[PDB]
Subunit: 304 residues, 4 copies
């Protein structure tokens, strides 16, 4: 086929969120894959009948684009190599360890006329798109993402950039207007691990209330939009509730809608490829790749 | 019995929230009732076999205490008459139209050694008390009270002290620590009617996010408490949800639990009577009667 | 007032399901009440400012109608006394200990030109009426009534005619067509206490599956109607669910709808009085009073 | 690897329910696939980097086992060919168009020492297994499978064998004791298409109520087990509800549990392979492959 794709990084995220969709290779040729651990590389590639490659460079030279699912700290150096070898790059969030590094990569991509897209899957979550499209005259939005036994020994800034970024990015995508921080809770363990974080993001027309508790009673995600005559909620990316006219209407995801379709991974990955096919840029480009991260760096830097 | 009770105001609130409880008069004598419309007064009194009285003063002279369910604007003048006649008073929120008037009434009640209690029923809502009792190491609380087609043709300030006051009072009762306003949204119609209001009330240990949308998709009230290892929610004062260990547990109010018991009206009314019997003040006394309203006046003054 | 009403039997059901309605005596004069236990009689009457009476007969002579809430075995001779004294009678289910005794009472009421009504409140449950009214082209109905720790040390037949009768009556009311019983499950303890009962009631156009588990994991009731393009459910008489077009829509009872209104007690009691006022027979009259009981007698006799 | 697997039939079921799991070929070599339409064959094989084969026979000769996802009417002829070529066979339900044919195929598999397994995935549904394993002293089971706009332009017997068979198979698996039909509803269109079917299956200890409405308000599947002190329900194979001690606990499938794991397809497919690896017959073999179909044939013949 026209488009040749490779994958770099065959870790748990690649295995559960990307491989299951991309290995049904309908709109591209799956040229090969690389991961540093040779044993794991050969086993995964064998399972899917994909050609294993011995390096980032050898794979990139045979591809038009790469799905990169490596650790955040390796993004900057790997993406610089890939862009210089002329391949489009899809990478999991965040783009790079710092926004400054991200800005450098963005400029390199535009110089090379290549798409550098960050995997904010929630922007492609079908039910999130539905409530966004159907909301008019919004008065408030609430977004939360809580975890069960999710309290670990990593500094809070890592957790913010790695996970809270999804909450902030979804907020900014829904706001579709400039916002300012008007409230913050940030609770840390004695050893500086994240317990709870919350913000109020104020826009001209409404505010967004974002919240993440790492030591909650369940793993939950919810977006709730309050608008004229209506409440819309999407729970765990896959149940849609609408309160209107004094009734609560509940819609489930279809019985045969796979979980990657539900969460937006299917559509975001296919969109990345489609944009290459049609010589256009995905909406997640440029400042869109780093605006949530920029806000988080400001929050992180305000911590005395 | 030892305690003689009378009721002033026999309108919708009295009929739905108080009379269904107080007319089964187990702990007091229901001496009589008054409301200005004579036909309505005699009809409601006849319905319940209660003696109708022709004035506030005539009724008060025969009672030890009065349940007052009149319009907010009439609270100040009526309560002054009642306290000066030596009767304890229970009144629906808010105490009076202004905090100043409330302060005056509180002072008068202290001078006369009488109980003046404001009807913040949510502090006696059984499920609210349950979640408050069982939460430890709280990180956040969210409280909302939304309405369907509930835009009112009155200035926003009236709607805040009449209705949002429940949200604010419940927040302060749950906080059990000082709080500061750290965020606000106040959206009004062109005629200055309330559409939406929200605040963040920040305490040292956690914050409370409050909200009220008057033009929502349903009538709903919810308190949600996020604490270490747990989420607790009470919906419409009568369904309790707990999320713990990755599962959700749902408890309904018992099949024969009456709605006034569910909402706290039964317990708050009984508590008022019990405090008279025991010669003590209810917890909703003094500054507790007006602390939520004080916060609302700061909001109103800022517009 | 034109209509004089009295109440006989002031037990737990009278206290929770009838007195809270009837003591707001809008459409009738509450003349008095009698119950065999004098101490209880006087306490309850004092609480509601009702006149206590010394006997069934002394009360009946001062009334046009009586709400009777006595034990099933006492219904027959009491009702005979009341109808012979010219009083309309509302009674809790079942009418009498046996269907042939009920048939006699019905004929006596006819001879005396009086109404004799049995308290099948579910026929007046607002949400049950709503789903009945909106269902067309029904293919199946499921009705269940389960209890938590509801095993009682009484013979199964008593539980069937005192509680399962509500399930059967609701089924027959929803069927509105002849049905034939089949597919019986009847599980009893060694001591012959009811554990579980179920039936399939087959009509020409659809069947109704009825069940009742007395040692379940919760107290619940549900009516579910499957029809063309639709599922309707009412849970615990107060939540209405509709599945149509691939969506579930849930409607709760209004925030101020009292539980007796929810369950049909309010409307059934008011219906009894209205029918007296307008000189007509209530919905539940004649064979409607005993049709469910007749089916249960056939069931009990087949064991 | 040791086990060589091929797939015959690359239609909608293969694509949604099998290929997504089997193409991650961890425990076998995916040797190739065949489907009659060459264009579709080459597209799907290209998508997954699998070798396309031009016939059933050429593929079978290179495999140890075959997953067969062809139309019911072709099962008998294809399965005879495969068993005679020495390949183990996994096929979607039902085994063949008739029980006579199925019995022949089973006997043929025994003669050739090969496994012939029918794809009753619900027996491997994790939540179904959980409730089955946790139920004791069952008093009743209800199973339904309803559809939205699911009326099919085929005779009812086809729909019973193709779809209601899941309901009946799950019932017999949960019963684990002999049952007798104690009730039946069967409603058809003028052209003899299935609208609604229901049965009561009576066992010594409890009954199972099965139903399927093809013109309902939503697509729904539910298994509910009533037992001593407990109600357990599994909805759409992926939400578990337990009612116990008067409260309802709800457990969702894990956020990263894929839908084929949820529905039992993953586990049934892996079990088929594991049994080949261990020289054992899988759970669903012999009479288990046709037990549900046998009951349906009796139902169909009784019409
Ligand atoms: Cl690796
Ligand atoms: Cl689907
Ligand atoms: Cl976008
Ligand atoms: Cl008045
Ligand atoms: Cl109760
Ligand atoms: Cl009530
Ligand atoms: Cl008594
Ligand atoms: Cl209401
Ligand atoms: Cl009727
Ligand atoms: Cl084909
Ligand atoms: Cl279980
Ligand atoms: Cl998971
Ligand atoms: Cl999936």
């Amino acid at each position: 086929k026209n488009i040749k794709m490779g994958m770099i990084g065959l870790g748990s995220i690649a295995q559960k969120a990307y491989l299951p969709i991309l290995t049904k290779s309908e709109r591209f040729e799956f040229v090969g894959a690389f991961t540093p651990n040779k044993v794991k590389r050969e086993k995964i590639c064998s399972d899917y009948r994909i050609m294993p490659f011995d390096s980032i460079e050898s794979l990139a030279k045979k591809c038009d684009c790469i799905f990169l699912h490596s650790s955040t700290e390796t993004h900057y150096e790997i993406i610089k190599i890939l862009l210089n070898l002329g391949v489009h790059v899809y990478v999991d969030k965040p783009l790079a360890s710092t926004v400054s590094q991200g800005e450098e990569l963005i400029e390199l991509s535009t110089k090379k006329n290549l798409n550098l897209m960050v995997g904010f899957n929630r922007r492609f979550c079908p039910m999130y798109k539905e409530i966004k499209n159907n909301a008019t005259e919004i008065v408030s939005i609430n977004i939360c993402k809580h975890g069960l036994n999710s309290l670990r020994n990593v500094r809070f800034d890592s957790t913010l950039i790695d996970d809270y970024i999804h909450v902030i990015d979804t907020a900014l995508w829904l706001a579709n207007e400039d916002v300012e921080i008007s409230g913050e809770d940030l609770f840390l363990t004695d050893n500086k691990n994240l317990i709870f974080v919350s913000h109020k993001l104020k826009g001209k027309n409404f505010s967004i209330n974002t919240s993440m508790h790492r030591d909650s009673g369940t793993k939950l995600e919810q977006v709730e939009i309050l608008s004229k005559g209506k409440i819309q909620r999407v729970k765990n990316l896959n149940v849609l509730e609408i309160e209107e006219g004094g009734n609560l209407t509940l819609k489930q995801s279809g019985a045969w809608v796979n979980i990657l379709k539900q969460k937006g991974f299917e559509d975001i990955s296919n969109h990345f490829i489609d944009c290459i096919e049609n010589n256009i840029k995905p909406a997640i480009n440029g400042e869109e790749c780093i605006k949530a991260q920029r806000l988080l760096e400001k929050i992180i830097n305000s911590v005395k």
